[PDB]
Every structure is written in structure tokens, then in C-alpha cells.
Amino acid sequence: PNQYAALTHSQVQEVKAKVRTVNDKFHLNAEEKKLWELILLGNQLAQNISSCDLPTDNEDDASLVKLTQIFADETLERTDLTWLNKILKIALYSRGSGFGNCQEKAFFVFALLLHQAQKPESLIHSLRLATFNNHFILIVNEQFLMDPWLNLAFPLSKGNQQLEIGYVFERFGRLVNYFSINQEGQCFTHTIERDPSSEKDMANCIHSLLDHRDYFDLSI
């Protein structure tokens, strides 16, 4: 039993059941299936990062997860870094250490897809981190929702989107945006605000991800 779990076993099994219901009704085209497979691989790669707040987690990992969480809290409080850089530094620390909770794993997949989005003719166009309280998720191309904490993903019907988000996460409350990058390369940070400092920091941030390419390698 994981005393530190932030959801119950049943709460998890319910979400998985609804993601299954949702994925059954979605029939994707070829290009959507390519991005889909990348999203699945990215979520799966994120499971290298061990959490301690799921019922299936090992309570023996609680202290090393707390170490990442203290690093993350201190990093987010810094005044000398942009928000994009804070997110990426935490992504890198979590992957490098192998420990992180929901926030860290969401940040890692954001970093992975931001890195992938630089590759020639990538299908990655937008990335939106948003939260149900402290439960982070990632919306890709306003077309897919990823939950690396739970290793689940499902498509969204572009337009009406609270039908599937509101179905899967019915008893999870309001989704609040956290940080996003649109197809134009503009950055938004937490109600939403344009984030020109992150925009100006973009290249240096992308460079720091290249310096740990192995953290994000999905190559066959």
C-alpha cells in the first residue's frame, strides 16, 4: 500500500475505462495515427521517471521523489529564469534523476515534444500544459490530450473538447492553463498571459535540450 498516493486505485481504473471508451469512438486518419504513435512513445518513455503518488508506486521512492520536488519548487520560485527555462530545467532534472511526480512527468513530455517539434517536417504544432489542481496534463495540437502521470492519452475532437476532457475527467474540476506554445512560436504563461521573455529565451532553451538528446531519444 502506498500511503503517499494522491489517487485511489478505483479512481485510476475509472479514468482508464473512460479513456478506453473515448479511444474506441475515435477513428484517426494516417497522419493523425503517426502523431498518435509518437505521443504513445513519448508517454511510455516518461515512465522511466518514477513517481510516489500513485497506488502502484513504491513507497521506498518517496524521499528521492521529494528531492526532485524540492528542486522543482525552488526552480519555479527563481526570478532569474524564464518560465520556459524553469519547466525544461525541471524536465531535465526529473529524467536525469529518474524520479518525479505528475508535474515533473508532464514537464518531461513537454520538453520531449518541444525537442521533437524541431525535427524536419515534424507534426508537432502546439503544446499546452494545463492542470486539474495539481494534476498536470499536456494538450498537443489542440488535438490530443496526454497524461504522462497515468500513461494515458486520447484524441480530442477539434472544436468541442470538454466532451471528452469532461467525460474522462468529470470529477476532476476545472482545467486551468499553465504554459503553452502556439504554432506561431508565441509563449503564454499563468489566466493566460503572453510571455515574451520565454519567447526571447526560446533558442537557448532549445539548445539545452539538444545537449541531453539521449533523454528524449525515441529512435528505432
Residue numbers in the entry: 58 to 247, 254 to 283
Excerpt from the paper describing this PDB structure:
Ceg10 is an uncharacterized effector secreted by Legionella pneumophila, the causative agent of human Legionnaires’ disease. We found the uncharacterized L. pneumophila-encoded Ceg10 protein to reproducibly break viral restriction in LD652 cells. Overall, Ceg10TR is composed of 8 α-helices surrounding 7 β-sheets in a conformation resembling a cysteine proteinase with a putative catalytic triad consisting of Cys-159, His-196, and Asp-204.
We determined the structure of the trypsin limited-proteolysis protected core (Ceg10TR) from three different data sets to 1.7 Å, 1.4 Å and 1.5 Å resolution, respectively. Interestingly, the conserved catalytic cysteine, Cys-159 (C159), is nitrosylated in two of our three structural data sets, indicating that this cysteine is highly reactive and particularly susceptible to oxidation by agents such as nitric oxide.
